């Protein structure tokens, strides 16, 4: 069926509540992910703390130890970034939505929202006249299609004397009497039936305005929401994007640094002077 | 105290068994790293399957819907990357260390490594001659400082003769013989104490030389593990680095462009003509 048909704006008004619903959704969606971003960061700092300790108590000293611990550090510094994502999603994006939802929706006392009950009210009194003066027409339709069908009944019960030569005098008098009263009956109904249509076609213009006038407002409101989503999702896109960052490559430019700084020659060197033949020795002498 | 003191070559030998353990530690270190990269991916893909349904089943249609879902996609393509890390870590870095750690370590039929019992036996082979040559000197020490101190007591037997005209020169002869007997036990022992040292010096150049080769043979083997750790870690750093990854930057340049394609006007135009004043209508007529 059509929107212009009485009470079919229902699905345009329903979009309002759906709008409020789509806010909470976009919030939970962001939040639920923000929680995952922290889950990763937390697992990294925990892991780092674990091995930064295991390596410490480990038997592996020297420059290699530093090169090793450099990875525990990268894990931490990565956690710092991902731990920043979380906040960037909640403190900014999430809230920026929560606020928009309140400054756009107002919970009516009874139920639903103000801007929802208003659209309904608006559409109603913007369709009322075209609906009421649609009853005059419809009440005239079943008033004419009842008389116009009543005419054929007279035309039928008029030739009922083609077999029975009964009271012919009183017959052709009454038969041609009812078909005449029915002639004006169908004509007077059509006359008042054409009127109702005029009375409606005159209500149409004003009805075409008030409706679209109430509808246009909804579109504008929905626009503010759509354009708002494109605005938030973009920010979110930048809060997830770590490729377009400089501090990221840094973490992996310095990791390569520390690892390369592992001079094996220098390690064996140290070990040679502290545990190897490089140690002093009181060679046995006369006492 | 010093490495050159007999037996004090354990620290440099214990280094061997440590080298093995260390490998096992670094393997667990990487395994736990990837195991987290996996859990992080699993959480992402499931976050996608989670909301990719809620959005498609939700009241959010049109371009804005696509822009929204566009996020789920980035959440998947990212998860896919961290899964490449898990594999790279376990299939290469890990399987590499494990492989190396077995090709350089062979457990005995008794326990311990063939290379552990390799250096120890080697050290003893080069130190035994020096040790046994020293055990003689050590005995000569409790040989000269046993007759030389035995000499000092011989003077006591004479010093005690200051106010005791006891025996005759007959006894003086008994203490007079110790002049050409006790003194000999000091000049003959000190003479041999010389030999023990002189002869030991003939067994120290060959001693250090030999003791050196063994130690260097450890420096060689140890070097291999060190340089290996460097080679490995370098690769590991590269398997964790998503900075210089072509696919990574693309993910977001693609997400962003997808969100910018979210035309608000596009969605609006559609609704008005599908549920609004745009819909056609059978304006009442004569029947
Ligand atoms: Ca250590
Ligand atoms: Ca949908
Ligand atoms: Cl409220
Ligand atoms: Cl209220």
UniProtKB/Swiss-Prot annotation, chains A, B:
Keyword match Nucleotide-binding: no
GO molecular function, one term: cytoskeletal protein binding
Reported impact of residue 174 to E: Decreases affinity for membranes
Modification after translation: Phosphorylated by casein kinase 2 (CK2). Phosphorylation by PKC probably decreases the membrane binding and tubulation capacities of PACSIN2, thereby modulating the lifetime of caveolae.
Residue positions, PTM Phosphoserine: 258
UniProt topology in membrane: Peripheral membrane protein
Example GO biological process: cell projection morphogenesis
F-BAR domain residues: 1-267
Gene Ontology, cellular component aspect: adherens junction; caveola; cell-cell junction; centriolar satellite; cilium; cytoplasm; cytosol; early endosome
Keywords: Acetylation, Cell junction, Cell membrane, Cell projection, Coiled coil, Cytoplasm, Cytoplasmic vesicle, Cytoskeleton, Endocytosis, Endosome, Lipid-binding, Membrane, Phosphoprotein, SH3 domain
Record comment regarding domains: The F-BAR domain forms a coiled coil and mediates membrane-binding and membrane tubulation. Autoinhibition of these functions is mediated by an interaction between the SH3 and F-BAR domains. The F-Bar domain also mediates the binding to the cell actin cytoskeleton through the interaction with CAV-1.
Subunit composition and interactions: Homodimer. May form heterooligomers with other PACSINs. Interacts (via NPF motifs) with EHD1 (via EH domain). Interacts (via NPF motifs) with EHD2 (via EH domain); this interaction probably stabilizes the caveolae. Interacts with EHD3. Interacts (via the SH3 domain) with MICALL1. Interacts with RAC1. Interacts (via SH3 domain) with DNM1, SYN1, SYNJ1 and WASL. Interacts (via F-BAR domain) with CAV1; this interaction induces membrane tubulation. Interacts with TRPV4. Forms a complex with EHD4 and MICALL1; the complex controls CDH5 trafficking and coordinates angiogenesis.
Role this protein plays: Regulates the morphogenesis and endocytosis of caveolae. Lipid-binding protein that is able to promote the tubulation of the phosphatidic acid-containing membranes it preferentially binds. Plays a role in intracellular vesicle-mediated transport. Involved in the endocytosis of cell-surface receptors like the EGF receptor, contributing to its internalization in the absence of EGF stimulus. Essential for endothelial organization in sprouting angiogenesis, modulates CDH5-based junctions.
Family to which the UniProt record says this protein belongs: Belongs to the PACSIN family.
The protein's name in its UniProt record: Protein kinase C and casein kinase substrate in neurons protein 2
